[PDB]
Design a protein around this ligand. Structure first.
Ligand code: GIS
Ligand code: CA
Length: 240
């Protein structure tokens, strides 16, 4: 997250870190959301490589012991049948991960609330991006969870030539575009938490930013619109 502020410990308990076995260490690669005690929702872009994956819940500092962490293997990976690595503009950037164990819920570990199917936010809706990704374009990862306030930009504006134009689809959400805050590398897969009816729900899965850089004016951060995939999610879980 560029232009973030450090997240309080217990504010975003459905945020996870998706890590891969890097040599003999484990590296943060992505974010995700816990949606079931044994299911994680992240971006399909995060699993394009055939890596050994793990999920960390109750994580606040990647490099220190918080005293709250649960570390769980991934048992199964389900990418969206229409995902294609070479065409991220097409959308379908979503994956579900079945965990090798069910985690224990607590104040640091909760399920992500999903929107109702087909829900679309009003322009300039109040949302937060969270993640441990680059705090600058070509920077380094954050050690602590970061948050940024990132209003939505409706499809009408977002698909205008000045913004993203045709690269964005109605199956996406755009948020931000101020040139100061954004998501950035290592945030994708993660949540966009939007306040609706006085409850935070997860409306986006962080997908991409400009090639030009992370925090680019009139280049919002782009998300998979979760409320487009609700049947899909429920079908996979039912059947796995
Ligand atoms: C985000 O999901 C993502 C994932 C990957 N690959 C893995 N981290 N293993 C590459 C790129 C991205 C996107 Cl494009 C990204 O970083 O978007 C920044 C918001
Ligand atoms: Ca930690």
């Amino acid at each position: 997250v560029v232009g973030g502020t450090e997240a309080q410990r217990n504010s975003w308990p459905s945020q996870i870190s998706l890590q891969y076995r890097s040599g003999s260490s484990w590296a943060h690669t992505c974010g995700g959301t816990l949606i079931r005690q044994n299911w994680v929702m992240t971006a399909a872009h995060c699993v394009d490589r055939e890596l050994t994956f793990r999920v960390v819940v109750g994580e606040h500092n990647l490099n220190q012991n918080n005293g709250t962490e649960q570390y769980v293997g991934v048992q199964k990976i389900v990418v969206h049948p229409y995902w294609n690595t070479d065409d991220v503009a097409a959308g379908y950037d979503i994956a579900l991960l079945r965990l090798a164990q069910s985690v224990t819920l607590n104040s640091y570990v909760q399920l992500g609330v999903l929107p109702r199917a087909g829900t679309i936010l009003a322009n300039n809706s109040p949302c937060y991006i969270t993640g441990w990704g680059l705090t600058r374009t070509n920077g380094q990862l954050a050690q602590t969870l970061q948050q940024a306030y990132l209003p939505t930009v409706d499809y009408a504006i977002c698909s205008s030539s000045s913004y993203w134009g045709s690269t964005v689809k109605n199956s996406m959400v755009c948020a931000g575009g101020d040139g100061v805050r954004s998501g950035c590398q290592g945030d994708s897969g993660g949540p966009l938490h939007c306040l609706v009816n006085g409850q935070y729900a997860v409306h986006g899965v962080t997908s991409f930013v400009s090639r030009l850089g992370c925090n680019v004016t009139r280049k919002p951060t782009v998300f998979t619109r979760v409320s487009a995939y609700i049947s899909w999610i429920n079908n996979v879980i039912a059947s796995n």
